[model samples]
Target: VGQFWHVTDLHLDPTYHITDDRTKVCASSKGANASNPGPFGDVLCDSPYQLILSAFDFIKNSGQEASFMIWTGDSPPHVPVPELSTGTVIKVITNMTMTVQNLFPNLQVFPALGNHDYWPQDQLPIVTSKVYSAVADLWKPWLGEEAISTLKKGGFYSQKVASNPGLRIISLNTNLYYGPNIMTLNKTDPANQFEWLENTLNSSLWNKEKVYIIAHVPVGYLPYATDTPAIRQYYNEKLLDIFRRYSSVIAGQFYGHTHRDSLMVLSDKNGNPLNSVFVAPAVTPVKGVLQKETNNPGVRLFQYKPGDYTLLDMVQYYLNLTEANLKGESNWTLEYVLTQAYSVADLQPKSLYALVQQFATKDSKQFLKYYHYYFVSYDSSATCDQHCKTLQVCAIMNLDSMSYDDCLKQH
Candidate 1:
């Protein structure tokens, strides 16, 4: 009944325009070598202000009134060193948040923090950090005083979607599970937001409310070697327990970090299938040849019943950067229809399980067809080919033990 914008990984870098001669030099310092495309290339740089503006224009001017926006973090551009600071984050994030508010005017924007939103990157800051106060205050108007206080208490917050009190959005700081996060060792809520989550879900259950978990890092895709306790797949394992325990109150989960369009299957402690994470594509199509990967700039529009939690369908809106960067004309277009293309009646765990089964057919043409949607937005030039991408689809689906090597053998 209500439609909201599910956008993430903006990686908006205000510093890009002012980089001067330091632009290429900075990329070199950050390790963009001869083989890799440099950071500021017309097509390869992180989000430019214009792209963000264009996306807003399309949404607002097109007369599509978004009920709210679920923005999964990473506003600071993907630069590693010197340029990242508390000031840069405030300037760009504040300006960006304001622009979104101005565009929507009356709607709420529920934002989750991305790792790069921190100056040092991947640091799950306690209230003591400058990054904490800056972002907390900026988002106060959107999440409200009490919720913002919760975020200040711990890097997480919860809000009831005003349009539907039956539904609650639990915004998490999954960064504590991220290996690079400096606060990974914190003892306080060392399970870092998990304790609070149990309480939140328990409260929701009593209230007969459904929940949507919005986080920057999806459980399975934590940014490290999954085997390492350093990365702690155990955190995801613990989370899986909660999902199964309160699966009904739980509805659609959303995240963004890999910058690629993807999904993850959730399961119970008994290994019974539970739900899926809809991993959104980034607004910044900036990954370089250095990484041998790239994603087009795009955003997802999710349609769901106002009172109910299941997603009815999703549509992707994209601007082809390969064309946009070269021609100075960014044609924003409606790229795909999820239910029509994927042939799913709704975005539920059972429907997603059907998608995994479809992928298992090893239908090269069908695999390639699904691959394009699963991997990138508009630009199909990403390095993941048919053979390579099929196995990746299997792996992400958690098929055959969710093991890449083992999944490939079964596929």
Candidate 2:
């Protein structure tokens, strides 16, 4: 079986608690450096390099070294807070990439772009003409020169994993579909990435190779209303169309950006579900529009058969920022194995379909277990009431209004 770790939304704050005393911009009003003392809530909002390294430590020492890592992106800190530069994005991502290489020297890695990874949040321009050239060049060492070369053409590329030849990773730059992107202004093919995606997947199907579509954002789901929903829905349908066209060749898919650990099942125009997008939670515990938004920082570990490419299970690993930071510590813990929690042998299209069906029953006992994992990563005594369970139901259904509403009616 093939083992790989899915870690994303690092949001590694190089500036976490680093601020000049004169400016007083830091959360605790502290000065700078590792010795600086900050409040617990400060760590709740972002991840310090110290804490991120701790998570890395878990990956390196977790006994089961992965074949490679599916590193969906986001290296920079959160938005609005000042002093962040393109250099910060490059610096943290480069350092983190090298750090991963150091920890698991033989383990191969494939990464995707995140919206916050750009210069001015959400502005992931495009290749030579826009933001793609510099990104391609900067990330060449990480993604390898060959993939970077193709990345320069558009913001997407594919390469066969060294450890496993049967699988090809198709990394897409979904930032093009984001309404705020400058490329969207001129009438383009959503960064022309979907065109590249189509060509790559078509070839994969022809070659009889299974593909893993890794990207920053999922095709149809956006966490925020910061941009145009109409445009997002438009390109979303196009991408789903492509996914349906080659659903047979697509083995698995990974996505990040919701920061909340969740999953989404995508369906084609005829309403046949294609695949599920496993959205990894953020490394930073930054709150989105909701207070307990992502709840805490998390990552995922996946197990699968090599030849048949059957997904065995996915293990979610996470740490409670509020829990540990209050005591001034970082305790990385094993959250849950998807197979064990959902009680399924394999994790794939048909298997996942069954898992979703089981959850929709909304039995009290099942709801109790579901709410525990849904509200937060670690074992929590946090009470999940009607409103809480409602949100949980929505997330479990991949935030599908139709399905969520239908599930609500069952109550």
Candidate 3:
């Protein structure tokens, strides 16, 4: 089995401090208990400089020896637009890129654009901009000229894996479809990504190469939301339609945006499972101010069948923020393996769909496991009743808006 790492949402806050004033626009103030902050990170705040350094160091020391890494983006802090600039955003992303490159000099890293990556957060333009050009230039070393050409055009690209033949990595700029991106509200296909994606998939299918779609946002309703989708309606439908058409060639879809551990099983109109989307948890332990949403700093190491690109198993690791704070140090430990956690034989779309079926029953052990892991064990104490469980299960099974509504009503 080939091994690789999936790390995302490193909301690196350089100004993070343990005792920063809570009322002020502080990097560490958005966490759970703003009065008491941790050295590594507090659940109320974004990731600190030390936390990011520690995560990278842990990966280096883990001895997993991953051949490559999938880094879904979100490098800057969750501060207001007034506090950030285009140049600052570029620097934050550059800092993350440099750190990864310097540490894992030879390891090939495939990255995707996140909503927070742009300057005026969630408003990525349709036309080419400095952000796209600079990122393409910075990532040119890992992604060759062919990929960078398209990346510079619209922040999306596909490249064939050098070592592994018949396999390609397609990185998308899904921030264009993000909900708050008013720039893309009226547009049908913002930046012509849907057209490009279809053509790319068709070409790859003809070449008989399996493809892995990597992006920041997963296409569907966020688990917590009852109706609103993470991606806008028109774009979501078009993108999924394109995906279903090329499902034969599409091997896997990896994403990171929700900041919680989650998975989605994509099915056709007839409810036949066609593909799977794995949303990796965030590296930042940033907890929401009012919503109280939070997750432990987590990363995933995946085992896949080489050449075929079939996902075999996953090993999830997390830094226990509460424990680390109490001890005054970081201890990145193995959280759980996917196969063991869910008791599934394999991670294929059909297999995961079967597992999802088991979650249909109210208060299932399998779903409880999913619920606990969804927060990366951050809110293990919280309980999900029948209604909440039903909502979660529906979100996993239904990607289309109509089907999602139907699913919820049926349950």
Candidate 4:
């Protein structure tokens, strides 16, 4: 079986040194207000980084060598805004990441660009302050001329796994779509990158390769309301069209930016599902608040064998922070088992919960017992609680004669 590891949204910041001015400034940024604590309590330390290294060590010891490794963006050397000392942070973070890369000499680490890795909106007037330019200069020497050129010229590129003839990994600079007061769709499509992507997928030369597209922000879901109209009108439609045209041209698409693990199956106009798109969990938390409360402090792994594909088997590994702490190994918890049950309620809440209960207890009693306990102890009043709120809302809307007042009645 072909095995690979997929990690995204590392959000590595070097100037995050426990005692730096940038860390202080980052602590005060919008979402990073002092009220909200940063990951590792707003100080850079060995916790997360140690966990990552330990994971690398485990992979090395597993005997099953990884086919390749993918970093789906948000690397250090971030946009150094005038108000923020991002340069210092970027330098420190990049150096640390580079050091990690050096440890795995054989691993091919592919990274994409996130919004943070671009020029600050205010600094656009001074093109020289472009973040990518600085990043390119810093990483080019180590990443090699070809890889750097591919990133600079196209903003997206694809590479084949040397061991797997049909498997190809494609990295897209999602920064093309995000920024301050700047949205990705509003920006001019990098014609060269778009053409390069299309040609790579359609060309006879690489017809045999199965592709996996990686980006930062997902194409279908725009989190912000301000961008939703544009996303729904143009971005989602055009993106799906391209994905549909490619067909199995892509086996899957992996992305980040949401900081939560999510999956969406893209379907064509005819209602035929095209391919699976997975959003990886963020390695670092945003201001340390555990918003979703699913699984935090984790990474994903993918195992690809010929003609077969399964997701949860690869992506949902839990890093046991407690275990890591006990072991005195940097508080990094790497998941060991592949068959562990994941709480799938976030998507198909009702059905998946029942299924999980069925699978776990072989009877619904225990499942209901635990579920009820969770609901009662944590959130009382709703049967399914917020676990299935999305479905509940949808169900309410489907009522034939339901009124807005009727919907609010329960609330």
- Global lDDT of model 4: 0.49
What are the lDDT figures for the candidates, one per model?
0.70, 0.67, 0.86, 0.49
Which candidate number maximizes TM-score? Answer: 3
Give me the overall lDDT of model 2. Answer: 0.67
Lowest lDDT block of 10, candidate 1? 222-231
The prediction achieving the highest lDDT against the true structure is 3
**Residue by residue across 1-411, what tens digits does model 4's lDDT show?**
566777765655433423334335342233343322233423122124544565556656655557677777664422336534556545644654575567766676666666555435212211223355555665453355555666555455566655567666677665554433243435445334555667778862356667778887666643222123212334444555677689666777788766555545555543345566656666554333333232345567776665433333453444444344445554444433223334442222233334332533333443334332221112223244342433233222211112212323543
- TM-scores, all models, native as reference: 0.87, 0.84, 0.96, 0.68
- Model 4, position 17, has a per-residue lDDT of 25
TM-score of 4: 0.68
Candidate 2 error regions (>4 Å): 18-44, 129-131, 134-138, 141-146, 186-188, 222-231, 269-271, 288-293, 326-329, 378-411
Q: What range of 10 consecutive residues in model 2 has the weakest lDDT sum?
A: 28-37
On residues 194-240, what C-alpha lDDT tens digit does candidate 3 reach at each position? Answer: 88888899889889999999999889888787877888878788889
List where candidate 3 sits over 4 angstroms from the true fold: 20-25, 28-35
> What's the residue-level lDDT of 324 in candidate 1?
66
Ranking by lDDT: 3, 1, 2, 4
